[PDB]
């Protein structure tokens, strides 16, 4: 099968600057009628892949003319003349010349923006959940940049590692930021045993973590 190799794996670009990504095929993609079945697609977060370029060099239907495909034989290039925030996502190449049809592994375009500290919010277990026997404490770390962040939980001032599950959003095209949710899940009995709960966020925007806490049974 034809191997489609994309590079780079990831690219971070400031809004208004160009972007260029490469796709190299292991076999020539020209066919016996002069057509090159090489397409480029973009998959935005939460969506299906969508058309961009086809026939190697041709703008597909409805696609903004900021996207250009070039190349031939085995080496192809996609250029974005000036990046916009809604261009973020994963770009794929695809070949239709050699059965079975194959896709490249994707290039993720990230938008570079100024650093932003997270907005941190902590939430006690709901009374409804506490009637259940379980107890989840949730912390949101929202709208920060860049994407690396750390969260630490403390129960009565002591660090707690068991029972934490984290989830991270994809980059938001509205403001080019990232967000993260951290949930500490305890039994109801152990939650009711302890008094104060703390989420600490550490982010390159500050040396000092952002600390949010509450006391159980205080509003």
């Amino acid at each position: 099968d034809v191997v489609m190799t994309q590079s780079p794996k990831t690219i971070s670009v400031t809004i208004g600057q160009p972007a260029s990504i490469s796709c190299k095929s292991s076999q020539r993609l020209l066919n016996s009628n002069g057509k090159t079945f090489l397409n480029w697609l973009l998959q935005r977060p939460g969506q299906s892949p969508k058309r961009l370029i086809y026939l190697g060099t041709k703008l597909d239907s409805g696609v903004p003319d900021r996207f250009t495909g070039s190349g031939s034989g085995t080496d192809f290039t996609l250029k974005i003349s000036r990046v916009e925030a809604e261009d973020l996502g994963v770009y794929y190449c695809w070949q239709g010349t050699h059965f079975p049809y194959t896709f490249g592994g994707g290039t993720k375009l990230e938008i570079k923006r100024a650093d932003a500290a997270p907005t941190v919010s902590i939430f006690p277990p709901s009374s409804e959940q506490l009637t259940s026997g379980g107890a989840s404490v949730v912390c949101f770390l929202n709208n920060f940049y860049p994407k690396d962040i750390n969260v630490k939980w403390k129960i009565d001032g002591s660090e707690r590692q068991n029972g934490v599950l984290n989830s991270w959003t994809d980059q938001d095209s509205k403001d080019s930021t990232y967000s993260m949710s951290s949930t500490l899940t305890l039994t109801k009995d152990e939650y009711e045993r302890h008094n104060s709960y703390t989420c600490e966020a550490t982010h390159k925007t500050s040396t000092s973590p952002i600390v949010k806490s509450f006391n159980r049974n205080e509003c």
């Binding site: 057509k35 079945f37 397409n39 697609l41 998959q43 299906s48 892949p49 969508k50 058309r51 086809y54 026939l55 041709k58 597909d60 239907s61 994963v90 794929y92 695809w94 239709g96 059965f99 079975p100 049809y101 194959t102 896709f103 592994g105 994707g106 993720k108 907005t119 919010s121 902590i122 939430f123 006690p124 277990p125 709901s126 409804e128 959940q129 259940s132 379980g134 989840s136 949730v138 949101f140 929202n142 599950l165 984290n166 989830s167 991270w168 959003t169 967000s179 993260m180 949710s181 949930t183 949010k212 509450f214 205080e218 509003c219």
Partner: protein, 222 residues
Amino acid sequence: RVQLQQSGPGLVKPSQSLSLTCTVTGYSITSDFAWNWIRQFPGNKLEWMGYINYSGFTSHNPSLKSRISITRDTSKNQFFLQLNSVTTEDTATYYCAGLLWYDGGAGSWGQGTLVTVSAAKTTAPSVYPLAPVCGDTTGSSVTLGCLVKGYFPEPVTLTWNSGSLSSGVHTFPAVLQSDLYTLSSSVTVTSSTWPSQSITCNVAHPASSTKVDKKIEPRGPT
């Protein structure tokens, strides 16, 4: 133009078959296109599975080693996927996609349907309100949330105020543990609007035919 939409069971037991339908609108399936099935695994990995074209001719990936059937029903303007002998490795998002036969142009994909291959049981979620602590309500914005815990399989849908509150929302990918998922969502609003303007998380879990509409009540007197 042409629009495609996948449908079919979201949860399949190992060793049985997945069966999906793609319904095409805006174009006849007997003209111009190849009608493809493509699936996506974690890590940006897309796999072409096969097509049926406008004249009923088919082709499929050798990777699927006699397990796949692609068919159509022209009276319904639909085409279909059957994949037998499934295993957990067939868990994926499945897309239908038409590309023109002549040149690979006008690619049009459906929204995708997740198919989970698992023997685990369908379970409806509990939806819990995340009301802010009092100390966190005195600034100019306030953040609220909802925790959707203990469901299987994916997906759920979650909106705020029936979709009328869309700005300032973050809905996080669900996390799987012990064959049950948990998802959270946050919403941030101007603090002086709350609690005067109520906020409700609307959760639907189609696999269990369950809906929950949870109004977020403040801590303190309500």
